Here is the input.
Amino acid sequence: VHLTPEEKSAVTALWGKVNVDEVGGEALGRLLVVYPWTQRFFESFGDLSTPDAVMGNPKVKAHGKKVLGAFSDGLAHLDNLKGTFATLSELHCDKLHVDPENFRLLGNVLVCVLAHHFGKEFTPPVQAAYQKVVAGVANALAHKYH
Amino acid sequence: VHLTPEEKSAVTALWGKVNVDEVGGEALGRLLVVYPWTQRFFESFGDLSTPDAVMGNPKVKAHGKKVLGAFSDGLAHLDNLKGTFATLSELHCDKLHVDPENFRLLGNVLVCVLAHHFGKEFTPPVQAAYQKVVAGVANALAHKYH
Amino acid sequence: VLSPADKTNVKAAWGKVGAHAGEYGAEALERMFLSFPTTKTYFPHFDLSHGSAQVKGHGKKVADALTNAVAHVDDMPNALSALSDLHAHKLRVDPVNFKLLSHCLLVTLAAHLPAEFTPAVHASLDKFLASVSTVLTSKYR
Amino acid sequence: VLSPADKTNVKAAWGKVGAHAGEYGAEALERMFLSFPTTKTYFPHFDLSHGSAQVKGHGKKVADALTNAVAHVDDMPNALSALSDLHAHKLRVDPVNFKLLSHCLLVTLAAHLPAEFTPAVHASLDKFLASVSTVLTSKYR
Ligand code: HEM
Ligand code: HEM
Ligand code: HEM
Ligand code: HEM
Here is the structure.
């Protein structure tokens, strides 16, 4: 991070306009649909074969809440973006072995979804700031491939 | 980093068997040949159009010496791999704006060249350790995109 | 590959984006220029500035070539050729840069088009542009 | 694309790697398994161990499919099809994983083949495998 006083705020102010519990998962939904290999890791999970049966997996809707979960712990703990995440990265990295660029697909699609929902008010200087958090949350979970 | 006592040593011990001044550049050579966009950044430089006229650019041979240069400052300062490089990353990032994955192509091809030259003694547990330095030197120069 | 039905979600998602393709292809340069500052390197001759008439004028161009691809999609090779020599021969764009316009373009269908932008379509648009950039990068490979 | 003369550096660099293609395709699994540990995830049923007869037995397979590609290279689509449904339909390999075998494979031509491994050829092999993985990843796109 850095977020300039003035990025800090376009960001902090879209977010509590944010219905977590149902964004958390339009996002995990959309990730297993657009980027399928990710499915390999959620077979603990259900029918994931036609797009409709994901976006209505009470199970894909549930894990996604956990995950808007920790963008939240980040969207503001932007100061170690690095330590809010040690455990999950220990988790995601040397436990499930998700390759680190599936970390960027996810914050990336999360943005497609921040945009899909707020339309015109996701001006571009306002997206530009989210590619920064995101690229940040992603440099953080990946910090144990070193 | 980390390098386990025992990685540390297969690494430290290929390197001084290493003719820097002429490896530095079989590598920069090979990068502008295999991955051309990189050329965009060395027009301060010469004929770079057929492979022979690069590998014998006294100018591509010269800059490459600078660069085995700083793998050297790294191959052993592996402790901040992060601070030996602040200035160059300031340099490579917010000065020339090289995208960070051209950082991995370069350490990557550097390995193709460590292998081309030492043949059979670049056993695999011995390459495996160089993908680690390398991925390290590359997470370091890129540290200002945050 | 790009199947019978992905070629239908795009023939259709573009169907409705019409009279606008040009305001859109320029809203997406703006977004790539702002978020991934590292692409500015190539438009040194642009006011990568916000009302900028050059970026507005180029949206029209990126958007004109997107459409010839949407039309002619069963054969991008051929139609997109000279944009695939210019981009790769004359200009040398690092190919990681297609991934990113690719993405701002979708953050844009998304923000101007909500009901047609269903998840299945979010996948086809993405499959469509992953193919425009493969064609765009091929004198490369 | 894959030009008149890249299709000649590969027809030839493979020419000389012959009777060995199988020791080589397995020296390169070993190297990908060791260096990028994150690919182990898929061979849970392998001794990703060093003498391992399964990895030795699969080198033969990766190396048998590399060759059908070197032969049939003016049309990979067709020949590599069932390895491009298995890899992408049945197994779901993250496509960033082709980039990396792609690279260990070259650290291997390199280490067993020095005089034929000139810089122009280091580029064609790379162009060749960037095409095997594009074919391998296409039910994807
Ligand atoms: C912003 C990026 C991501 C964040 C913040 C995140 C966060 C989380 C969290 C909080 C959990 C549950 C932790 C707990 O309950 O204790 C989890 C689980 C999981 N995540 Fe991630 N995740 C991210 C990206 C990814 C990606 C790209 C994948 C690749 C498929 C992935 C795969 C998984 C899997 C398989 C689990 C199951 C947990 C387990 O079984 O141990 N995640 N994630
Ligand atoms: C291990 C990765 C790399 C290292 C260690 C490295 C190191 C260096 C060093 C030491 C210099 C000269 C600094 C000085 O003399 O003060 C330099 C210059 C330069 N490097 Fe890098 N480099 C790396 C990767 C790259 C990549 C991927 C590119 C992309 C083309 C690149 C492009 C350049 C350019 C254009 C210059 C010219 C310097 C200038 O004009 O300011 N380098 N590099
Ligand atoms: C969807 C992918 C893209 C498409 C369809 C596309 C299309 C085009 C077209 C049609 C032109 C002008 C055509 C002509 O005048 O003959 C152009 C020019 C250009 N494009 Fe792209 N482009 C794409 C991606 C990119 C990316 C990622 C970059 C990154 C640098 C880029 C940089 C440029 C530049 C620098 C020019 C020339 C600008 C000038 O000097 O006027 N393009 N592009
Ligand atoms: C040069 C690129 C590659 C080629 C040419 C290739 C080729 C093959 C072939 C021919 C088979 C077996 C064919 C058959 O039995 O019908 C196979 C199996 C397999 N490949 Fe690949 N492969 C490549 C890259 C990869 C990568 C990057 C991965 C990463 C996971 C991978 C994972 C697998 C797995 C898991 C199997 C099945 C193993 C088993 O259960 O027996 N392959 N591959």
About this structure: Residues C 39, 42-43, 61-62, 65-66, 83, 87, 91, 93, 97-98, 101, 132, 136 surround protoporphyrin IX containing FE (ligand 3) (CB under 6 Å).
